[PDB]
Amino acid sequence: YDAIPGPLGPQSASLEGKVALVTGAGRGIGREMAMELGRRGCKVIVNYANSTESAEEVVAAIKKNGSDAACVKANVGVVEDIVRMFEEAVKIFGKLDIVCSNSGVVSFGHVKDVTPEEFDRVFTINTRGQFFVAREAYKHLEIGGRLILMGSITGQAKAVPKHAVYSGSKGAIETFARCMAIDMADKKITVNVVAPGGIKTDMYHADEYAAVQWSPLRRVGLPIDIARVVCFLASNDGGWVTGKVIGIDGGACM
Amino acid sequence: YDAIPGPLGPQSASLEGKVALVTGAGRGIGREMAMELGRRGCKVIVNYANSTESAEEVVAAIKKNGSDAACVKANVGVVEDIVRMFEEAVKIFGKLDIVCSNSGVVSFGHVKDVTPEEFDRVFTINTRGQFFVAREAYKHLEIGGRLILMGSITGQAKAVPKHAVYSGSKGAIETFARCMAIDMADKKITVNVVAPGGIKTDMYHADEYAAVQWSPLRRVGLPIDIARVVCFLASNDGGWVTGKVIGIDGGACM
Amino acid sequence: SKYDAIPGPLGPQSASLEGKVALVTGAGRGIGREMAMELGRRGCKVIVNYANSTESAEEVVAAIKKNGSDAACVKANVGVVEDIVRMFEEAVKIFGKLDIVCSNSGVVSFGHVKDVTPEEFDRVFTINTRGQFFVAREAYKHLEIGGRLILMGSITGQAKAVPKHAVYSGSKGAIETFARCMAIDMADKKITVNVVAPGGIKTDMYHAVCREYIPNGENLSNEEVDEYAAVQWSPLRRVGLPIDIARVVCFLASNDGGWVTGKVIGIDGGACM
Amino acid sequence: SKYDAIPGPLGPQSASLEGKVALVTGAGRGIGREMAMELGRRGCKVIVNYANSTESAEEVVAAIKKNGSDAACVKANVGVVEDIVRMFEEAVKIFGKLDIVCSNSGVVSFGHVKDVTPEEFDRVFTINTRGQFFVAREAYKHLEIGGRLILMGSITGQAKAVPKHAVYSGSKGAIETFARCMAIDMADKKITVNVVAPGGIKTDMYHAVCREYIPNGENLSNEEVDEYAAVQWSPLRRVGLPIDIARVVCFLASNDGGWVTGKVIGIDGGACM
Numbered sequence A, B: 001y002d003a004i005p006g007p008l009g010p011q012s013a014s015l016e017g018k019v020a021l022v023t024g025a026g027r028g029i030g031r032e033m034a035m036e037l038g039r040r041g042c043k044v045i046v047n048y049a050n051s052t053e054s055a056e057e058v059v060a061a062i063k064k065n066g067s068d069a070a071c072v073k074a075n076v077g078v079v080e081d082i083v084r085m086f087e088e089a090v091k092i093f094g095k096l097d098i099v100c101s102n103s104g105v106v107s108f109g110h111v112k113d114v115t116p117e118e119f120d121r122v123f124t125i126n127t128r129g130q131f132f133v134a135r136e137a138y139k140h141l142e143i144g145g146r147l148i149l150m151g152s153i154t155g156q157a158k159a160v161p162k163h164a165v166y167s168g169s170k171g172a173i174e175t176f177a178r179c180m181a182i183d184m185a186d187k188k189i190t191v192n193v194v195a196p197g198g199i200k201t202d203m204y205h206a207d208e209y210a211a212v213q214w215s216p217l218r219r220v221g222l223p224i225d226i227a228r229v230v231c232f233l234a235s236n237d238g239g240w241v242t243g244k245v246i247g248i249d250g251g252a253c254m
Numbered sequence C, D: 001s002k003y004d005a006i007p008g009p010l011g012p013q014s015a016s017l018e019g020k021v022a023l024v025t026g027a028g029r030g031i032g033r034e035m036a037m038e039l040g041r042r043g044c045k046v047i048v049n050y051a052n053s054t055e056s057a058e059e060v061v062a063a064i065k066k067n068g069s070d071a072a073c074v075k076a077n078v079g080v081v082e083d084i085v086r087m088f089e090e091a092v093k094i095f096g097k098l099d100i101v102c103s104n105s106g107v108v109s110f111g112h113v114k115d116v117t118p119e120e121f122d123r124v125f126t127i128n129t130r131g132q133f134f135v136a137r138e139a140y141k142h143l144e145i146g147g148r149l150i151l152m153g154s155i156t157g158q159a160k161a162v163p164k165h166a167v168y169s170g171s172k173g174a175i176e177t178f179a180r181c182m183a184i185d186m187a188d189k190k191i192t193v194n195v196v197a198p199g200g201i202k203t204d205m206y207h208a209v210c211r212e213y214i215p216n217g218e219n220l221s222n223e224e225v226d227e228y229a230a231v232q233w234s235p236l237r238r239v240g241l242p243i244d245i246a247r248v249v250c251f252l253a254s255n256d257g258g259w260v261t262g263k264v265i266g267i268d269g270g271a272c273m
C-alpha cells in the first residue's frame, strides 16, 4: 500500500494517449472540454445531437491542434442512442479512458407554472440522460478510467427563484456521483461532478453584473475555467478524488 | 417587523383545527404522520394508490383518536390524479393547511444493471410525483401553509452501494426544497424536506445491526420519530424554518 | 422487537417540557433571554446565566417566575473554564437536575483578514468556540440520561458572501463539527446534541453589526436596515426574531427531537448569505 | 467583451508551476514534506518550514535541490504569531516573492469530550486553527497578486462516525469556513483560497492515531491497520498516500485552479467516516 500510484512530478497531469468522449461537445462548455482535452494529448469523441456542422468544426479544430478527434451523433434522451454511441466510440479509437457527461438543457419557471412535459424534457436530458451515459461509460471504460458528470451551483444554490426543475435535475447528479463512485470503483474508475457557476455560452446568454455580482474575483466564468478542472480530474492528479462535487464558480454565492 | 408571529408559549406547537393531506398514508411512515397529525388536532386526508382497506383503517383510527379523517385515491405517477386529488381534498374539509409529500418506492442495483424502466419507475414516483404534489399543494394551500417533502439520508450518504437510482431520486428533493421555498414564500408557505435514516416499515424490511450500526443511541428508527418532526415543521414553531433539510436518523453515518 | 417500543408519549405531550430544568448561557439579553422565557413558558425551571448583565438577568428571572415557572440566575464567564464548572455545580444544586442545556453565549467580530489581531481572534474564539466546548463538556457530565444539548451556530458557518467575517464565521463553523462529533460521545447517556444556526436576528448584536452584512449600508437608517433584512435575507419578507429561534430550541429540547442528533438546523427564513 | 479574455495559457501549460515560489508549513515530514517535494518537482522554489524537525527539514531541502529546483528551510512555530510574521519576511527575502502558500502544519488529538482539558483543547486549536489563520493573514499580505493559498482540513470536518474526536475535528472544520470567508477578502488581490480535506493518509500522524478510528483496532497489527484502511475507508481498496494530496495541491496551486476558490476538496478515495 506504499506503492506510488502513477508518476511523481508533472507527468501525473498528462493526458497524453488517452481517449475521451464528451457529450454535447459541438458547442459551449462541452466544446471547450473537448478542445482542452485534445490540447493535453487526448483523442476526443465529440458527441452531438443536433449541431452537426459545429461538431465537425470541433473535430477539425482538435485535429489542427495535434490530436485525433471524431464525432458521433446521439441523443441522450434515448437510451438506445447512448448504447449505440458507446459501441461506435470504442471502435473509433479502440478504447475509452475518460467520459465527460456534459449534455444539458436549461429551464425557467415558478413551480406553479411547471408542466409535466417541461419537467420531463429537462429531467430526461439533465438527469436520466447522464445516468445512462454513466451506465454505458462504466461498461466501456478502461480499468482506472474516469467519469466526470455535469452539475451546477444551483444544485445547492439558495436564492435562485423560478428554477426548481433545472436545479433539481442538477442536484440529483451530486448524489449519483457519491453513489456511482462506490459501484464504479470495482473497475478503479473515479466518478466526480463539476458544478459550474455562470459560464459564458449560449445557455449563459439565456457581463458586468455577472462579474461584480457572482464573483469576488470580478470577472465572468468561461468554458476554459471548467475545462481545466475536468482535465485535472481526468488526470492521474485526480486519482484520490472520487465521489466529490467540485464547485467552479469563482467564489459565487447564489 | 417586531410583531411576534403567532402565540408565545406551547400553543405555538398546536396543530388544532388544521387540515393536512398526506400522500401514501395507508402504510408505513405516511400512516404514522397521519395518525400523529390527527392526535395533535388535524383533520387528515389519507391518500393511497393501492392499499384501500389500509387507508380506511387509518381514517377510522384517526377518528377514534378524536379527529376527522377521510381518504382519497390517487397515484402520484399520474399528474392528472394529483390534480384531482387536491380538488377533492379541499372540498372534503374546505381548505388545506399542511401537505406531506411522502409516497415513495425503494430500488436496488449496481449502476451497470439499471434499466430505463426501473429508473423511470422510481423517479416518476419519488421525484416527479413529489414535484407535482408540491405544485398542486402550492395552488391549494392556505397563505401561511406548510409543505413537507420526503427525502432520505441516502441523498447525502457516502457508503451505500447499489443505490444510485433511489438515492439520486431523493437527493433531488433537497434541491427542490431550497428552490420551492423561494417560489412558495409568496404565499408564506414554508417548504422543507425530512430525511429519515432507516425506519421500521415494510420498506425497511427490504434490528440489532440497525440499532448498533446506524445509531450511537443504539435503537431502531420508528415512524413516530419522523412523524414528530413533521408536526414540528407543520406547526408555528417551524415558521422560520424554510428551504431546509432535517436529517432524522439518530446520528447515523451512511 | 423490543426495538418496537415507542420512545415517549404519542400525541402533543411529546412536545411538552413540563417539569424540565434547563440552563441557558447568556440569558440576560438577546436570543438567550428569549430562549429562557419560552422554555419557561413551556414549563421549564430555568437557570439564567450571565457574565455582566446582572440587572437584566434578574429581570429575566423575575419575568419567568411571573409566567408561572421557577428560575434563578448564575454568574459565569464562559471564557473561564473554572466558572463553567462552578456554574453547573451551582445549577444542579438550585433545581436538583439538568435536562436541557442551551449554549448561547457569543460575541460578534468584523474585519478584513489582513487586519485581524491575535488578541481579537483569541477574544472571539475563547467565547464562541472554546467556551461552548467546555459548557458542552460540563453539560455532558451533569445532564440527565436522555438530556439535551443545543449549541449556537450561525448562517455564517456556511455563508459564502460575507466579507470581513472570517474570525466570527469560523468560530461558529467549528460548532457544526462539534455537534456531529459530540453527538457520538454524548449518546452513551442518550443525550442529543444539535446546533441551531440563525440568520440575522433582531437583538443588540443585530443592531451593532447588521450594517456590516449590507453592502454600503453603513449609512442606512434603522428602518432601511430592517427593510433590507426583510427583503434581502428572506423570501418570507420579514426580519428574524429571537422567538423564531426559541421555538426551534424548544422542539429540539422536547421528546419530538429524540431522533434528531448531530444536526445543524438553519433558522433564517430561507436566507442566502 | 473584455471579459472574453482567456485567463492564462490554453493547453497543458496551464498546469505548470514553473518559476513559482511556494511556502509549505510543516514541510520537514508527512504530507507537508511531499507537498514540498512535488511542488519542487513541478518547477517551484520551496521554503520548507519546520518547528522542530531541523535535520528532516534540511533533508527535504537537499532532496528538492537534487530534483533540480531551489529550496530553503525557515524555522517557525505556527503557535507563535511573531514567528509566522518573521517567517514570511525571511521567505520573501530568500526568493524575492511568494506565489503559493500551503498551510499544512497540524497536530492530532483523541479523547471523549468529557475528558478534554482546556490545555489539550488550547494546544490543538492554537496550531490547527489559530495557527492556520495567521499563516493565512500573512500569506495574504505577502502573496503575489494572483497568488494561491491552500489550507489543510480533514474528512473529520464533516465526518459523522468518528468518536472521541471533537477537538481535532472541530479545529479542521473551522478551516472550511475560513476558506469560504477568506476567499472573499483575499480576492481583492486575485488570490484563491481553498481547503484540501484528506482522509487517512500514511504518515507519522497516521500510524499513531490510525487505530483510534478503527473500532476495537487497538490490538491491530500494522498490516491489519493498512488492510482495514484499504477496504474500510475506500471503494478503491488502497491506502491514501501523501502524494495523493500533493497532486491536488499542485492543481489548485496552478492556473488550472483559477476559477476554484472558497472550496473544500475532499481527498479520501471516496471514504465514508
Ligand SMILES: NC(=O)C1=CN([C@@H]2O[C@H](COP(=O)(O)OP(=O)(O)OC[C@H]3O[C@@H](n4cnc5c(N)ncnc54)[C@H](OP(=O)(O)O)[C@@H]3O)[C@@H](O)[C@H]2O)C=CC1
Pocket: A023, A024, A025, A026, A027, A028, A029, A030, A047, A048, A049, A050, A051, A074, A075, A076, A077, A102, A103, A104, A105, A106, A125, A150, A151, A152, A153, A195, A196, A197, A198, A199, A200, A201, A202, A203, A204
Ligand atoms: N453555461 C452555464 O452557465 C452552465 C452550464 N451548466 C451545464 O453544463 C453543460 C453545458 O452547458 P452549456 O455549454 O452552457 O450549454 P449550451 O446551451 O451552450 O449547449 C449545451 C450542450 O448540450 C447539448 N445537448 C442538448 N441536448 C442534448 C441531447 N439530447 N443529446 C446530446 N447532447 C445534447 C447541446 O448539443 P446540441 O447542439 O447537439 O443540441 C450542447 O452541445 C450543461 O449540462 C449545462 O446545464 C451548468 C452550470 C452552468
Ligand SMILES: NC(=O)C1=CN([C@@H]2O[C@H](COP(=O)(O)OP(=O)(O)OC[C@H]3O[C@@H](n4cnc5c(N)ncnc54)[C@H](OP(=O)(O)O)[C@@H]3O)[C@@H](O)[C@H]2O)C=CC1
Pocket: B023, B024, B025, B026, B027, B028, B029, B030, B047, B048, B049, B050, B051, B074, B075, B076, B077, B102, B103, B104, B105, B106, B125, B150, B151, B152, B153, B195, B196, B197, B198, B199, B200, B201, B202, B203, B204
Ligand atoms: N422506511 C425507511 O427506511 C425510509 C423511507 N423513506 C421514504 O419515506 C417514505 C415512506 O416510506 P415507508 O413508509 O418506509 O414505505 P412503504 O414501502 O411502507 O410504503 C410507502 C408508501 O408509499 C406509497 N405509494 C407508493 N406508490 C405510490 C403512488 N404511486 N401513489 C401514491 N402513493 C404511493 C404506498 O402506498 P400504497 O400502498 O397505496 O402503494 C405507501 O403508502 C417513502 O417515500 C420512502 O422512500 C426515506 C428514508 C427511509
Ligand SMILES: NC(=O)C1=CN([C@@H]2O[C@H](COP(=O)(O)OP(=O)(O)OC[C@H]3O[C@@H](n4cnc5c(N)ncnc54)[C@H](OP(=O)(O)O)[C@@H]3O)[C@@H](O)[C@H]2O)C=CC1
Pocket: C025, C026, C027, C028, C029, C030, C031, C032, C050, C051, C052, C053, C054, C056, C076, C077, C078, C079, C104, C105, C106, C107, C108, C127, C152, C153, C154, C155, C197, C198, C199, C200, C201, C202, C203, C204, C205, C206
Ligand atoms: N443576533 C443575530 O443575528 C445572531 C446571533 N447568533 C449567536 O446567538 C448568540 C446570542 O446572540 P445575541 O443574543 O444576538 O447576542 P447579544 O449581543 O445580544 O448578547 C448575547 C449574550 O452573550 C453573552 N455573553 C457574552 N460574553 C459572554 C461571556 N464571556 N460569558 C458568558 N456570556 C457571555 C451576553 O452576556 P452579558 O449579559 O453578560 O453581556 C449576552 O447574554 C451568540 O452566540 C451569537 O453569536 C448567531 C446568528 C445570528
Ligand SMILES: NC(=O)C1=CN([C@@H]2O[C@H](COP(=O)(O)OP(=O)(O)OC[C@H]3O[C@@H](n4cnc5c(N)ncnc54)[C@H](OP(=O)(O)O)[C@@H]3O)[C@@H](O)[C@H]2O)C=CC1
Pocket: D025, D026, D027, D028, D029, D030, D031, D032, D050, D051, D052, D053, D054, D056, D076, D077, D078, D079, D104, D105, D106, D107, D108, D127, D152, D153, D154, D155, D197, D198, D199, D200, D201, D202, D203, D204, D205, D206
Ligand atoms: N495523516 C492523515 O491521515 C491526515 C493529516 N491531516 C492534516 O495534514 C497536516 C499534516 O499531517 P501529517 O503530515 O500527517 O502530520 P505529521 O504528524 O506527520 O506532522 C506534520 C507536520 O506538522 C508540523 N508541526 C507541528 N506543530 C507545528 C508547529 N507548532 N509549528 C509549525 N509546524 C508544526 C510538524 O513539524 P515538526 O517537524 O517540527 O514536527 C510536521 O512538519 C496536519 O494539519 C494534519 O492534521 C488531515 C487529514 C488526515
Ligand SMILES: O=C1OCc2c(Cl)c(Cl)c(Cl)c(Cl)c21
Pocket: C108, C154, C155, C156, C198, C199, C200, C201, C205, C206, C207, C209, C210, C211, C213, C273
Ligand atoms: O450570523 C450572524 O451572527 C450575528 C449576526 C447579525 Cl448581528 C446579523 Cl445582523 C446577521 Cl444578518 C447575521 Cl447573519 C449574524
Ligand SMILES: O=C1OCc2c(Cl)c(Cl)c(Cl)c(Cl)c21
Pocket: D108, D154, D155, D156, D198, D199, D200, D201, D205, D206, D207, D209, D210, D211, D213, D273
Ligand atoms: O482526519 C484525520 O487527521 C489525521 C488522521 C489520521 Cl492519522 C487517520 Cl489514520 C485518519 Cl483515518 C484520519 Cl481520517 C485522519
